[PDB]
Chain length 82, copies 4
């Protein structure tokens, strides 16, 4: 049993309305300390060889479903459940 | 300068349509190894005393904007940018 | 061929951090005319009897996947593609 | 008082992982009638001249906050609350 962690974000360089909105709404409420906000989708996949082979598999999941390379960047962390 | 990381999820015990959907769509495509999926929103707040005081501040941001305790659970990690 | 439209929102009475955030960020930028914001997920399902029977089917999709009654309210519109 | 409705979607031609996922998870559960799914974010803005002038204003909100033209397409409907 392994836990794969998939972080998905917008391509580097693409402005993110969600981040910008959170920032401004935060400053609006008084938190002027907040200088910048960014958001991501975190996807935890719990699945059944070894971590490198798992990473390969989720890599495929991303490639053909989870993320769109044109607008998305993503990264995968695989930890064995012990 | 500090980087506060806010993870927001649904209350423990509430079924999440997104997780369930991802799982089934994943099994549907062949990845029968995938046994369970869960999703979270990750919010990175870059802001300007010390980490415990920062955590207190984002704690407030959550309390009055970022998350709704009725339907949300959340956790905060604060790292000093060095 | 029919187009089913599924609108999903938070239960009536549950505060929505997204709506609140958008509002404040909007006022923050100058749009003080904006008095209130609300957000929804719109899901267009294109599928293959008649509209009432389709509505029944998507009703089931919602019931067992698309939405969680505990935290979600939803409504379904079915139009025949002509 | 007017209700502006903002529909935001991915640019025409960009594959949407959410839509694809919903479709497959739906077929996976038996709903083979479902042939295609698409998703959108609906944003209802309740605000305070006349509908054409309101549309202009939300147009600006979109242009500078709500949506990113590079990855987003959007449309605005303005109805006077009567």
């Amino acid at each position: 049993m392994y836990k794969a962690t998939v972080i998905i974000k917008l391509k580097k360089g693409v402005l993110n309305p969600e981040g910008r909105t959170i920032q401004r709404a935060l400053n609006f409420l008084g938190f002027n300390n907040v200088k910048e906000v960014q958001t991501y989708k975190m996807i935890d996949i719990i699945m059944e060889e070894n971590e490198e082979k798992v990473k390969e598999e989720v890599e495929e999941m991303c490639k053909k479903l989870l993320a769109n390379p044109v607008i998305h960047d993503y990264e995968i962390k695989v930890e064995k459940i012990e």
